[PDB]
Design a binder for these strands. Structure first.
Ligand code: AGS
Ligand code: AGS
Ligand code: AGS
Ligand code: ADP
Ligand code: MG
Ligand code: MG
Ligand code: MG
Lengths: 437, 346, 319, 328
DNA sequence: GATACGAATCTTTTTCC
DNA sequence: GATTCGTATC
């Protein structure tokens, strides 16, 4: 009659498929924001889909909020198209009415379904309003719990503007730099449910459906299928849905679960060190491109390969292989985003690292490319050069090109001004700061 | 003011390093009415801009050197605000379209087609020149607007664009301009200019050899040599000796240190350190083309390398310079060049 | 000018018993039809293998006389923005309709792979709030385009490519119901040119019948063209360069195929191509990419394609 | 005023009997019309092979008089985004037919210029309103069409025009314009056409314009080559012979002299030499690889422009070097 | 007591609401 | 995907 994941919802936090450390680290935080004069204004939970975030919040607000109620959860409804109110004001009205939940009223807030953040205006409104909540001058506020499901937005009609929410729906691409780095903000990233918890809970669902399971003689096989489901996915709801589909069926239907997306560093490691259980490089790269073309079709991926190919055996491999890798990357850079470029580059990197991979290798740790740092440094240089050029006209009539500023006037003119400073003009230090090594 | 600007020749008769080019400029400026479109090409720092300004003074008289700077706003396809600085004097205009990136086409269209159609009648009609510094940095889309702009509206505007190594300039633009070659001064002329500068500046000079040293170290760069002269003048209490060190820019020293490291230690970790150095160089907005050029010509000055290694280095440098021309990210090609060099040296 | 429905829509199955191919999936769908507890499901596979027909047949066999106001079929041709999702889907799900005991409303979302992400989030809210009264059936070509939060709630059913036997059986049914004369080799040729597509097989059979009558190999191959991916694979795997050049010329250039189409098909073939080493495969991919760039810049002559084949033979022949 | 038009859009066929070359496509679409059943067509082929002509003639034959209100034609010149497909096409193929009855036609000329969103929307319009509307999709590049859109369409391939079709159309035009044409001129025109009829008509118009008195004088191959500015086959053979047999200095001199005699371009010579060499029986196989790779590189560089003398000497050197493997 | 497992880290700058 | 460290269990 009802879905298995809906009729088998845990009744207590002992029944929830969560790690012990995760439960402790969410309970301690939730108590921390509950006490008056709490340091943490809001709590942000982030992770994949169906990692039992909402469930633990339900039970924790069930056995925590009553303790601090003086003499439940309140969720935002984006579907509430109320009369006389624009859509962008719905969250404003909700937050204004939900802040009146302090005295004689206590209800933890769960923002499970966010407002539409793909529209830039209302996304910015969301940022500004949650910042106003964070920086609020109110004496105290009810605790704010926001759950974000990290999912990759797949490709669609070729028009992408935000560049953050248009490639990945995550807390980093929704919330800005100020919001996440805040003393009063607490963030607990979640992890997929491990195979042990999945196996135990699927066994519990089976031992609660023995008659039907025994009716269709599928109980002599349930253990292998439970292990297979636990190994395939880290999603509790999807695992239970697949188990229900298998149990209620009467045939030899293959057990198929939703495919989980591959992260950035996951893809980098798969390109560098290969993938276990797939000794075919061709098929692994093919599946990587079909499933994660959004991540692989970018300049950031080639930059990551260039930055992290030296982490194979702590740079202890032949220079010929490194030259081949960088040569192929440079050739791929001359194809302007054609699919053949990415395919050839990744295939060549994988082949090069396969021909040199053996046993006894101790690899390093990959890192994100530092290109954004160089862009910020170049922007600071541009600002300083503009300032120097501005000073270099009204003080004395002279127009100098920017190339000369980068070449000679960024070093010789500050040197002259420093000598003039010692035997005595605004710009006395070197442009872009000193160089080292 | 710097000694490069303090002693800039303000007249066609005040240029005293090429002579024959000055005679050609005077021949051009004898009858300004039929002046064609000009393209000044020559090594960096030889004095092309000074020659353009001297020709403009010869035509329009003194007053071309009264530069007024104003910021004019643009709008792109995505409707972002861009601010180009237009150094404007009477009788001529200065524009550096490279101040914007690939978005210089909208400048070359809006700003230049505005003045091309706008006549200069005040019953008498004059043609106002427009100077385009760094004509190489145009992106083959600004030049395509440029060609018809100056072909059809020649009656009202004249184009004088300065550049070095005019190979990235398209054939339609080159065919539409008078090609003026500006060679770099010899060491004797640089030394003579420096002698005049020190004489007018009351710097105590031990011997004249230390001016030939400046001229040789600047590699035919008048501005670079004058900046070195001022640097050692203000770092030696206005008294220069043969012990006064030849000072070179910091990035040149960094590139030479990188060359020494590349020749000495050749491993993947050395490659990573070289990548860090290259990223530091790029953080100082030093263009990757000149980074590769200086790296190549410092690696060809190492005496421990035989002819085979040097030939391999120059071949790889040419290949990766062509790659850098057609590329989008410089670090790929810089790292590839360094890796190829480190793989060929051993 | 007259009235005669094409065989593709005249013979579209109306019951789940007439759908060929994935026997286990269709049997499961029949079980869902009889018991009636339909879960949220996602249907994905190649085009023209019975995905839309399976969904609509399941809806009919599940709702009966209540199909008129029991399904809300929304497709790519219809507007499916965030506001449309919210308003229409919410009002349909909130509509209290008395159904048989084990029955639910069905919301068919065909071409769900072409839906905006925010609309998918609104679908998440609607799916998790009104699940007790209505169920969702997604029809798509690839399940990647459906966000993970929506795939979490659905029972994924994957439709495999139709085998030659199933398509042959359906072709025989249509033939013995339309009275067309045929030959065994003709039906074999129709099967071969269909390449696992039932709609293409029906279209080719109808075209052959209309154009020539009797369906033999000669008529079919004189009206329909052999799949050019197979010709591209034949030309890429040729032993010597002369044979590859001759195949390219006489089978793709004289036949009137665009050079960009040849290059793109060559890349797609090279991606899925066994019996070749990884180094050789990636070298072929690189050469195909360079030739693709030359084609894109305007140099799309036969000389460029011949040169690409020559470079491929250099790399794969140790030449 | 059909005498005030270019020859290409003056001899555009008005009836299906005037579309030459594509015998099978025309026969099958005529059978579709006769039987009263028309599927969703897809016409694919090279440019100037008779796709728009065929579809317009077919629509005129189906709706002789109601053509204005029975056919909706869209092409690349009209915006065809998601909104256009959603509104205009759906509302046209959602309303009852004019006059007594029939099925509405929606022709999509140059449908490879449509975005994937528009095609994805169009597929359900095709599948849903097929009872009273049929689609025709015209495309030169099939890789720009979504696989679903290709699935729900009946594919008809337009081959490049054979010799006989071009000869028949040439005869028709010569009769219409009171022109003459030598058999050698006919062969030259056939070879330069490369399966395109627009090229034939344009060249013939230029040949009539070249002649001093187009009522008495004929058109020979000399006029063909002079007006179209192409190298004669004899010139190509002479240049190749000089490159293969003679030494470097005389080969370079012969190339320059042949080029300057009639102002020939180097790309035309390259294509002619490639066509000649494709018939050559090479015995080393590496002779072909080197020829193809080097000549493709030279052709690409020529396409980007540059030094003509350098490129010509490069052509000579590439040919002589490759033919070194032949004797090996 | 061995060992497999699990957690953290490895990330910063044409079309629709 | 790799490393390191820490658990928990058998
Ligand atoms: N043993 C279990 N432990 C936890 N959740 C369970 C269990 N069995 C079934 N469930 C269900 O699994 C679902 C998991 O939902 P949550 O992960 O808490 O929400 P979520 O993380 O926001 O998922 P998304 O991202 O919205 S798809 C809930 O609907 C639970 O009722
Ligand atoms: N298994 C099948 N059995 C019988 N007819 C089929 C089968 N698969 C497809 N067809 C025919 O194909 C047409 C409808 O196919 P659809 O199921 O609508 O294609 P599809 O699977 O939805 O692919 P897309 O993604 O919608 S293009 C009708 O003419 C059906 O008769
Ligand atoms: N089969 C043919 N018979 C007679 N004339 C033809 C034929 N094919 C093309 N032509 C001529 O070519 C002209 C233009 O060709 P069209 O068929 O209208 O263009 P097209 O075939 O659609 O090619 P594209 O794809 O639009 S560039 C017509 O006006 C005719 O004069
Ligand atoms: N004939 C000359 N006599 C004295 N100084 C000169 C002469 N020619 C050039 N210079 C000096 O060279 C310096 C830089 O030259 P510049 O015109 O900037 O070269 P470029 O046009 O290549 O940028 C100027 O400051 C100018 O003073
Ligand atoms: Mg939840
Ligand atoms: Mg369908
Ligand atoms: Mg057309």
């Amino acid at each position: 009659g009802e879905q298995w994941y809906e009729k088998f919802k845990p009744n207590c936090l002992e029944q929830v498929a969560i790690h012990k450390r995760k439960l402790k680290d969410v309970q301690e935080a939730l108590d921390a924001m509950f006490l008056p004069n709490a340091k943490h204004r809001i709590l942000l939970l982030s992770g994949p889909s169906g990692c039992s975030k909402s469930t633990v919040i339900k039970e924790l607000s069930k056995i925590l909020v009553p303790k601090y109620r003086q003499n439940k959860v309140t969720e935002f409804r984006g579907d509430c198209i109320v009369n006389d109110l624009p859509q962008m004001e719905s969250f404003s009205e909700f937050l204004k009415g939900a802040r009146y939940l302090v005295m004689s009223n206590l209800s933890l807030i769960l923002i499970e379904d966010l407002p539409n953040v793909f529209h830039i205006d209302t996304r910015r409104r969301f940022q500004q309003l949650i910042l106003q909540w964070l920086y609020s001058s109110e004496p105290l506020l009810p605790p704010l719990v926001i759950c974000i499901t990290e999912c990759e937005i797949p490709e669609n009609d070729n028009n992408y503007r935000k560049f953050g929410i248009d490639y990945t729906f995550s807390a980093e691409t929704i919330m800005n730099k100020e919001i996440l780095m805040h003393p009063r903000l607490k963030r607990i990233k979640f992890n997929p449910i491990n195979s042990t918890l999945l196996k135990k809970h699927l066994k519990f669902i089976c031992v609660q459906n023995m008659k039907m399971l025994k009716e269709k003689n599928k109980w002599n096989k349930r253990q292998e299928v439970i292990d297979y489901i636990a190994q395939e996915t880290g999603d509790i709801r999807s695992a239970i849905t697949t188990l229900q589909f298998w149990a209620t069926s009467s045939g030899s239907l293959p057990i198929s679960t939703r495919e989980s997306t591959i992260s950035y560093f996951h893809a980098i490691g798969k390109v560098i060190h290969g993938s276990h259980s797939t000794n075919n490089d061709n098929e692994m790269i093919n599946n990587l491109f079909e499933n994660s073309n959004n991540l692989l079709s970018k300049e950031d991926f080639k930059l990551g390969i260039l930055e992290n190919y030296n982490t194979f055996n702590k740079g202890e491999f032949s220079i010929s292989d490194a030259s081949s890798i960088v040569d192929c990357l440079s050739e791929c850079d001359n194809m302007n985003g054609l699919p053949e470029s990415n395919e050839y580059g990744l295939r060549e990197v994988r082949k090069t690292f396969r021909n040199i991979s053996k046993q006894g290798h101790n690899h390093g740790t990959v890192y994100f490319p530092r290109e954004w740092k160089v862009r910020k440094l170049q922007n600071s240089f541009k600002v300083q050069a503009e300032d120097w050029l501005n000073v270099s006209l009204y003080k004395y009539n002279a127009v100098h090109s920017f190339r000369n500023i980068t070449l000679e006037f960024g070093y010789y003119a500050p040197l002259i001004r420093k000598c003039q400073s010692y035997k005595k003009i605004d710009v006395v230090d070197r442009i872009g700061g000193p160089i080292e090594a | 003011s710097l000694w490069v600007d303090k002693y800039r020749p303000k007249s066609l008769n005040a240029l005293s390093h090429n002579e024959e080019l000055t005679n050609f400029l005077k021949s051009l400026s004898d009858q300004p009415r039929d002046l064609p479109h000009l393209l000044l090409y020559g090594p960096n720092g030889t004095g092309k801009k000074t020659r353009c300004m001297a020709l403009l003074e010869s035509i329009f008289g003194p007053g071309v050197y009264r530069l007024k700077i104003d910021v004019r706003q643009f709008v792109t396809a995505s409707n972002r605000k861009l601010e180009l600085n237009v150094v404007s004097s009477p009788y001529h205009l200065e524009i550096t379209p490279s101040d914007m990136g690939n978005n210089d086409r909208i400048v070359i269209q809006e700003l230049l087609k505005e003045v091309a159609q706008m006549e200069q009648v005040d019953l008498a009609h004059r043609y106002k020149c427009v100077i385009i510094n760094e004509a190489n940095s145009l992106t083959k889309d600004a030049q395509a607007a440029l060609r018809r702009t100056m072909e059809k509206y020649s009656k009202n505007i004249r184009l004088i664009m300065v550049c070095d190594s005019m190979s990235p300039i398209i054939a339609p633009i080159k065919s539409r301009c008078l090609l003026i070659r500006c060679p770099a001064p010899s060491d004797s002329e640089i030394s003579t200019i420096l002698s005049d500068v020190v004489t007018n500046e009351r710097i105590q000079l031990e011997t004249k050899d230390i001016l030939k040293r400046i001229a040789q170290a600047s590699n035919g760069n008048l501005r670079v040599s004058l900046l070195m002269l001022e640097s050692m003048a203000l770092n030696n209490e206005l008294a220069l000796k043969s012990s006064s060190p030849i000072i070179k820019p910091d990035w040149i020293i960094v590139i030479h240190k990188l060359t020494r490291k590349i020749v000495k230690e050749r491993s993947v970790n050395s490659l990573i350190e070289c990548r860090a150095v290259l990223y530091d160089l790029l953080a100082h907005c030093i263009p990757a083309n000149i980074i590769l050029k200086e790296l190549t010509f410092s690696l060809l000055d190492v005496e421990t390398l035989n002819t085979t290694n040097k030939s391999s280095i120059i071949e790889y440098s040419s290949v990766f310079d062509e790659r850098l021309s057609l590329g989008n990210k410089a670090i790929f090609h810089l790292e590839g060049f360094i890796a190829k060099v480190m793989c060929c040296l051993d | 000018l007259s009235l005669q429905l094409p065989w593709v829509e005249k013979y579209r199955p109306q019951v789940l018993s007439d759908i060929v191919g994935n026997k286990e999936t269709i049997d499961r769908l029949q079980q869902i039809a009889k018991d009636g507890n339909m879960p949220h499901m996602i249907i994905s596979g190649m085009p023209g293998i019975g995905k839309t027909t399976s969904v609509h047949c399941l809806a009919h066999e599940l709702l009966g006389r209540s199909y008129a106001d029991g399904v809300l079929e929304l497709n790519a041709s219809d507007d499916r923005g965030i506001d449309v999702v919210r308003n229409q889907i919410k009002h349909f799900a909130q509509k209290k309709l008395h159904l048989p005991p084990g029955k639910h409303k069905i919301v068919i979302l065909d071409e769900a792979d072409s839906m905006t992400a925010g609309a998918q989030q609104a679908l998440r809210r609607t799916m998790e709030l009104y699940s007790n009264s209505t169920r969702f059936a997604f029809a798509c070509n690839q399940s990647n385009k459906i966000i993970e939060p929506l795939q979490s709630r659905c029972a994924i059913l994957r439709y495999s490519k139709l085998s030659d036997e199933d398509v042959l059986k359906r072709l025989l049914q249509i033939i013995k119901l339309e009275d067309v004369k045929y030959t065994n080799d003709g039906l074999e040729a129709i099967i071969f040119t269909a390449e696992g597509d039932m709609r293409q097989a029906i279209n080719n059979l109808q075209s052959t019948v209309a154009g020539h009558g009797l369906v033999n190999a000669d008529n079919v191959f004189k009206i329909v063209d052999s799949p050019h991916p197979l010709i591209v694979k034949k030309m890429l795997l040729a032993s010597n360069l002369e044979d590859s050049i001759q195949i390219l010329r006489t089978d793709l250039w004289k036949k009137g195929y665009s050079s960009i189409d040849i290059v793109t098909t060559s890349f797609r073939v090279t991606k899925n191509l066994a019996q070749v080493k990884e180094s050789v495969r990636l070298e072929m991919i690189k050469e195909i990419g360079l030739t693709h760039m030359r084609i894109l810049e305007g140099v799309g002559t036969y000389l460029q394609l011949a040169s690409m084949l020559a470079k491929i033979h250099k790399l794969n022949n140790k030449a | 005023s059909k005498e005030n038009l270019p020859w290409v859009e003056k001899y555009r066929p008005e009836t299906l009997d005037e579309v030459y070359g594509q015998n099978e496509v025309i026969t099958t679409v005529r059978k579709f019309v006769d039987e009263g059943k028309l599927p969703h067509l897809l016409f694919y082929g090279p440019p100037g092979t008779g796709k728009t002509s065929t579809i317009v003639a077919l629509a005129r034959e189906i709706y002789g008089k109601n053509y204005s209100n029975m056919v909706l034609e869209l092409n690349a010149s009209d915006d065809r985004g998601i909104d256009v497909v959603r509104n205009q096409i759906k509302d046209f193929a959602s309303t009852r037919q004019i006059f007594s009855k029939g099925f509405k036609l929606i022709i999509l000329d140059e449908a490879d210029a449509m975005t994937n969103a528009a095609q994805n929307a169009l597929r359900r319009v095709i599948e849903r309103y097929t009872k009273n509307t049929r689609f025709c999709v015209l495309a030169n590049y099939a890789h720009k069409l979504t696989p679903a859109l290709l699935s729900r369409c009946t594919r008809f391939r337009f081959q490049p025009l054979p010799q006989e079709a071009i000869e028949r159309r040439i005869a028709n035009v010569l009769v219409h314009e009171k022109l003459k044409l030598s058999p050698n001129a006919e062969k030259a025109l056939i070879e330069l056409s490369n399966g395109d009829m627009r090229r034939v008509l344009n060249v013939l118009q230029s040949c009539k314009a070249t002649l001093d008195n187009p009522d008495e004088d004929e058109i020979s191959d000399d006029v063909i080559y002079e007006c179209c500015g192409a190298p004669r086959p004899s010139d190509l053979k002479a240049v190749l012979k000089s490159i293969l047999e003679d030494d470097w200095g005389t080969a370079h001199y012969t190339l320059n002299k042949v080029r300057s005699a009639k102002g020939l371009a180097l790309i035309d010579l390259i294509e002619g030499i490639v066509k000649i060499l494709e018939d050559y029986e090479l015995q080393n196989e590496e002779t072909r690889v080197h020829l193809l790779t080097k000549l493709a590189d030279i052709e690409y560089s020529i396409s980007k422009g540059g030094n003509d003398q350098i490129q010509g000497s490069a052509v000579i050197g590439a040919i002589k070097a490759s033919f070194e493997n032949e004797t090996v």
